[PDB]
Design a protein around this nucleic acid. Sequence first.
RNA 1: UUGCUCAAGAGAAGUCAUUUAAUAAGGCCACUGUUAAACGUAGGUGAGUCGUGGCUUUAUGCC
Length: 97
Amino acid sequence: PNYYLYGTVLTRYGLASLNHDIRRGNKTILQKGYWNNGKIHSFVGSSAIRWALRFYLQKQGYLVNRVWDEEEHINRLTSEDFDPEKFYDDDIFGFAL
RNA sequence: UUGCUCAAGAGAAGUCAUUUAAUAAGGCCACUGUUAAACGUAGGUGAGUCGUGGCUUUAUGCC
């Protein structure tokens, strides 16, 4: 049967400066917009969280097609052809060429 | 003085009276703009009115 895992996770309190918007001028301003009650809330992109999850998968030793160098800051592909059967990355996050 | 010399085709008259291009018609039925992504890191400003009034020590600032 089809099974789904939905979840809302709440992070710990602290100072935050993540996923900044365009660094126009000298300021590095946050990614902010409207939320409930019509007040301004700061946002963090979901692509960053997906990248963090993929990096966790890579660091834990699971076989992933995309590998982060952590030194040259370049993403390298283990195999040009995407194989979701073998790679955790392709199975979970999908792919598109 | 020219086969010439002169020489009005002239006077008057409504193309009129009447007539629906009318009756009827669905541009209709179907369509995902699908799939993937770290913001990394450095780019600026245009425009009035004129002589103390409630607080506060003139002071000097609030409305």
